[PDB]
Symmetry: D2
Subunit: 485 residues, 4 copies
């Protein structure tokens, strides 16, 4: 199949220019004005529209069982929703229980995903415990299973938390094999104590998740893991950055030349924790995730500015929807509300509205935070994240003059609540092209399950590791030459 | 003339890839592997080399008379030196005296430059006073003379300094016409008083320039002009950022979402003010420029990290050499030492060594700070600052395994001192191509004077102004609707 | 002589609290201890369950002042009565000469209004609203012969009271030479003028204009500027009306660097939000109008209170300048004409007690520091005032920390028709107020003849600032490098 | 009784200085004033031109301690003698039980070594080097019956004294419940262990290893962590041995936020640089070894001194633990075996006088605050100690601010064969030292029987920290949202 996108503006993360785009056999063939193409192409009129790289969502949890609930979206519905939302690649999470095999958990995820995915994907692997067998499995995964990123938690005590000596060893191992170390940095002991205290004070409602983990617990842990990472010489990637305090730690570390990257979520970047205090339990529960949304009304604006600024690099949905009925496992004990919100479909439009229409960043920075930075990180750039000849034809024809209002009743992503309910959005995907085929057009989705493919991710991505080679020569530490005492 | 650069790695600010480059009629025609080209091309072997966009030096002062001395390099020698150093465009300064015509000063500069330049160039225009006639000349300059950037000074009292109400009006006017406001931000009253105090205390030597203007005078002024700029909604561009204090003001402003860009110089980024305390007068005088090099030994590393980080965006030479004999105008009164150091030839190699070999940034960020960011700012990107089909063939074949040691005796730039004397440099230009011709190769320079061209710079560069359109809708200020008292 | 025994209470100084009785005779505290031997026939005041504290010293009052064409409704009699009923036993008033008029004349007129009327001790600050050699000579006369050690300057009120940078420099130089304290209201006046004019042009005429037209960056900028000037002239600088987080942070950073910076805030800035300016009722909104304005950031109060507890801010004042609604209505159609002033001389001790002490931000001793002792040191009156010890002036309040007062305009004795704290339930009430060793308020009755209070000359070079500077002056020779002929 | 009149001097307390004589009888200051009526036959001390200050209180000493397999060379007799000769009249010693051994036993052994030997008053801190319910019960016994109100914890010395996060949490909870002060040495112990091991593997065996292996981020991280823990448990936290700009900034930021944080540093950290570790002579370099180490950043001293002046740091201690060169040489081939300790109990008053007061960082009153008064408040001994007033203990130094002493190992009475301040010319000498109302040092002669000093029980809940917290405890109900069944 052969596709001509005609009359639009191509928007990459570096600049915008008027140009048509010609696609064939999964691949962008030409970009320019007045192209010489074979006749019989499908012509897509993009006048007045922007032609952007499809979104890449670096955090998704399709099919995941978590806190005794199974995410409502499997790999087919989740990728569909992504595509209807202008995202053309997802990275899913693998989360083995403590003491279980990382490789088995990865293979099980591959088995669920390969036959269902509608778009390209790859996987992060969780490191929820530490032992010789874990290190050997890390290695196997990077060496031959196309993994280059692991996820660790500083919180979820007794479930997924690693202690400081374990993190030290884990980061050392990630660095040796050229992997990215993703970390969720809240202080797990202080979280556990805070939750227990709040319950003992009679706070059982969803607001407990905000009260029990104030932002200093995030800032502290973020500061600690940056320091551990800097001592092991491992690039560190903070996830779900939620607060001004943690943003400030990250900015100060970056000023000091430390190798720190950071990601936030659509929700953290746009919504306040005031939702946890809503009179309706279900509404309040529906915003429950960690670290929690914050009360400080400056939080959104500041996180959005950090994104515009490249203090935060990447924005993800962290999609993990649950229904109100599932959330209600914690109707009487907030610590049992499963953590997850929906957003894989909302991400592009929401960030467009608050980021670009809101004047925090321009359309090019929007591409950077929604695809290009991720692609570099994953070692997939410019194959993904850029409209140029030779790249994968993962392309969105984006309408910056659209009329969409977001609602749960029209969404295709799972969950019974949409967090952005009633938000007017000026940017929507008009057409989505994935692997050089139109999968969404005129409001209709059409794609067979299993069309998408796993994309092995090569180790040592340049955008982080290239400078670390030279930096490692720079840390030349020698003693003083004395004669012996 | 037709040129094939074969076997090299193309290094743009986004990534590096193996590819040959084919040039014809001033313009890059193709970039790829195994190109289909007409025979009889000049083939340049770039195996083991990097093929980068030629440098763009955003601050040069060829032919300028300043503080009663005339810069040693005219537009021919200065552009030659730039080219031998891997820089293929320069932006020169126009500096009309108070109460004189901006347009006449610009036309005089054009007259000196057009017949002499070896590479492409454009010009900044200084705004050294304020009146209706100045505003009208700003307009004429942007509307029809290809100017999009003005330079202002917060210091040089009685010579070039603008007062606060004048800066306010100047920034307002720059914004209305889509220009970039460059500002040298030191507190001119406090500078004047400090210089007078130091002289009265018997400090006559070059170290006076460091003692008389400590870094708080920079930080204060930087803070003030950012605030004025934010109130007028004008993008502000700080120049010659020299200190940790001023860097911190700039970072904090950027965290707050203010529209601030910033430039530093090779020297500020790499050298310490310890030089001003050298026993030999000439050595000490040779480092005299403003704001002065700082004593704090962390200063270089921190400014280099800011550059890697994009807290500082761009690095310039600020080339203005004078001889020891000219400097000696101030042998008995440091306030009469003319401000200027040489560096148009040194910039690429020096930053390569301290930036890339030193492990602060990778080769791609190096391109960003030496050409691409400048090009975006100037409204010349991707025509300049990028190796891609259609761009201007301003190209350097850069050897990252070179053996050069810097010395005044081998330099082609003017001045009798080289500031980097004896520095070993691992990166040097092997070949320099300007407007699709080889101008430097096998250590030989060859280019006729006047080969280079003036490049009109269009107003409202997107990389700054695109977001300001949306941001300006965002500042919707309305009263409270009351019934009347 | 009148002889007074305060029995059974706890003495609270700024350093510690102890159980002790207090015996007063002839204007002076004679004894403090647990079991006193006193002449019979004393008036016995039962202070069981009460605290015996030094009377408040309010460092900023504007009795009888005409300002922005309105005359403050409290003259020196009613204003000092109100102070006393509120637990304040000394006031410092402002002298404000029109630009180009005599500082001495304006001081002598204020003395004429105050000396015959004051109920409690007082002194005066003198405004320096312009500069010329003649102003310098008057500063010298005032410190040398008129018991002045403190001058007030403005960086805002352009064309009325604003001083430019070169003038502040000279002014601070002169204050320092004669051992005076330089109080400065630091907002950027040019930007305030332009902001006000721009807000009016945008149709904002309501009181909220005062917030919109001078956002906090105008304060932070100016605070930063004057600290820098002061540091260059070696003059202690004292910031007044600190209103914002930004300006507070500048002050804290300066103090970290060893700069000699002190700072004051007001009751209102420390306790109230600018949301009041957006009230539907015009009068309510106008009533809160003062400068710098109350801020919208909801964290502002808490942060400023914490700064006070922490000694980033040293002193809390009322800045009492009440106007009626009828006078505020001068600006009913143009917010720039609403005269700046709120009431609070009576409210200060109770309000800060409630928000500061009961609110858990500071303890009772720090309360005494920030309401009397720090002021006393600064004024060169410590331990004569601000401390309960033998030999001090008997300005003493018997304070009830348990009892509440609900504040209301209908019950206040201070002037104005609005109380800013209307309906606030305040713990901490003065039960008895003693001034110059007489009971002037007791059992809710006020009893004091006009003109009982005295002017208190304030000696130059107060140790708490100057002792360190004088030593720095001997300390520091920066010297040039020694080079030979 | 012995009766002493100190005549003609200036009394310097932490709040102010005044001219006054001082009369002492029976261990106690009886009178302070200008012209005293005293019984004849007093010993008259002529203090004309001198300052009469409260004797120093050294909050960190390690007399008779065995540590890292070396026994401190000063026992309680020589250590208190040295303190006295140096103007310090009370010491607080450390108790350090091995992990899993009884806090009470270790306290009782220290009491047995001290009670028969001390020349001046003293008390003890108790180390909490492990946690279990049994440790909690011992903390309670100690505060309730053994005159302890202060415990010392370590975040470093892994496997020896380090406490993990869950243990610190529990420990701080317990300290708070019984009204004790939690002193903490905050470096990240895991990272210190790994750093030391990595430095040795890199061939660094010299003393500079102590600097290289624990850079300041390890301190800043841990300081940040324990402040956060403390804030969550509502326990006042007291940081010890603050050594770096990074850790100082964490402390200042925490204090800005109203967190209850106090902090101490040492003479050496406040005055010396880590350049000493790079000295060519092994012994010289080893002699400076302590933790956290002296830092290389040349601004460190000045900044820490400024923090002290500024009350970001409250108290300065010696941390006296001298070893000989012969004992240091345990680590001649492995820097991790050099025992941590430097001498300084005798040097503290003079060194801080010279660098703090003569150096212009603080005045004489603040000097008294940071050498005696703040410590006294913290210990719950103020104004009994730390203040010259009637009724206080007669621990008094007649201090000569003009006279100099050149410090040298050859003339010192404190132990060790190196003085860290060798050859420093110090203004400020104790001329006379009075302890418990007897002259123990005068005319360079020391005269005091061993066991003259007494243990001083330290009462729980010192007001200066706890009065604010106790009120916060009543203050704060965070409550859940009210939703109906």
């Amino acid at each position: 199949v052969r596709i001509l996108i005609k009359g639009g503006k191509v928007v990459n993360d570096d600049c915008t220019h008027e140009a048509d785009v010609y696609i064939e056999n999964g691949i962008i063939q030409q970009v320019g004005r007045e192209l010489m193409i074979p006749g019989g192409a499908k012509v897509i009129d993009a006048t007045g529209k922007l032609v952007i790289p499809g979104g890449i969502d670096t955090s998704t949890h399709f099919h995941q069982t978590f806190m005794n609930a199974t995410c409502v979206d499997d790999f087919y519905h989740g990728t569909k929703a992504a595509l209807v939302g202008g995202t053309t690649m997802i990275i899913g999470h693998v989360l083995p229980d403590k003491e279980t095999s990382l490789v088995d958990a990865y293979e099980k995820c591959r088995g669920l995903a390969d036959p269902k995915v509608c778009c390209d994907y790859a996987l992060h692997v969780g490191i929820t415990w530490w032992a010789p067998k874990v290190k050997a499995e890390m290695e196997t995964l990077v060496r031959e299973k196309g993994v280059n990123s692991f996820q660790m938690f500083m919180t979820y005590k007794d479930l997924y938390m690693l202690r400081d000596s374990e993190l030290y060893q884990v980061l050392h191992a990630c660095k040796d094999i050229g992997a990215i170390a993703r970390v969720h940095a809240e202080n797990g002991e202080l979280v556990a104590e805070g939750a227990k205290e709040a319950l003992d004070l009679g706070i059982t409602g969803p607001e407990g998740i905000e009260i029990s983990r104030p932002e200093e617990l995030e800032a502290e842990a973020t500061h600690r893991v940056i320091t551990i990472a800097n001592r092991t010489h491992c690039p560190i990637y903070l996830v779900n950055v939620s607060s001004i305090s943690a943003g400030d730690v990250i900015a100060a570390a970056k000023m000091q030349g430390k190798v720190v990257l950071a990601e936030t979520t659509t929700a953290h970047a746009t919504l306040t924790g005031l939702h946890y205090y809503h009179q309706d339990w279900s509404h309040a529960a529906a915003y429950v995730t960690v670290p929690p949304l914050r009360l400080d009304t400056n939080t959104s604006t500041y996180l959005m500015s950090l994104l515009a600024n490249d203090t935060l690099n990447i924005v993800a949905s962290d999609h993990r929807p649950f229904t109100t009925k599932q959330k209600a496992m914690g109707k009487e004990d907030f610590t049992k509300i499963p953590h997850g919100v929906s957003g894989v479909q909302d991400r592009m439009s929401v960030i467009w509205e608050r980021g670009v229409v809101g004047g925090k960043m321009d359309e090019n920075r929007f591409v950077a935070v929604t695809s290009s930075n991720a692609a570099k990180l994953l070692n997939l750039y410019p194959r993904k994240g850029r409209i140029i000849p030779g790249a994968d034809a993962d392309v969105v024809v984006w309408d910056p003059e659209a009329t969409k209002t977001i609602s749960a009743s029209t969404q295709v992503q799972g969950g019974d609540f949409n967090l952005y309910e009633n938000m007017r959005c000026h940017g929507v995907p008009l057409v989505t092209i994935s692997r050089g085929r139109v999968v969404y057009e005129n409001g209709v989705f059409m794609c067979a399950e299993g069309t998408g493919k796993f994309c092995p991710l090569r180790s040592f991505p340049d955008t982080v590791y290239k400078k670390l080679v030279q930096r490692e020569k720079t840390l030349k530490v020698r003693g003083v030459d004395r004669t012996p005492y």
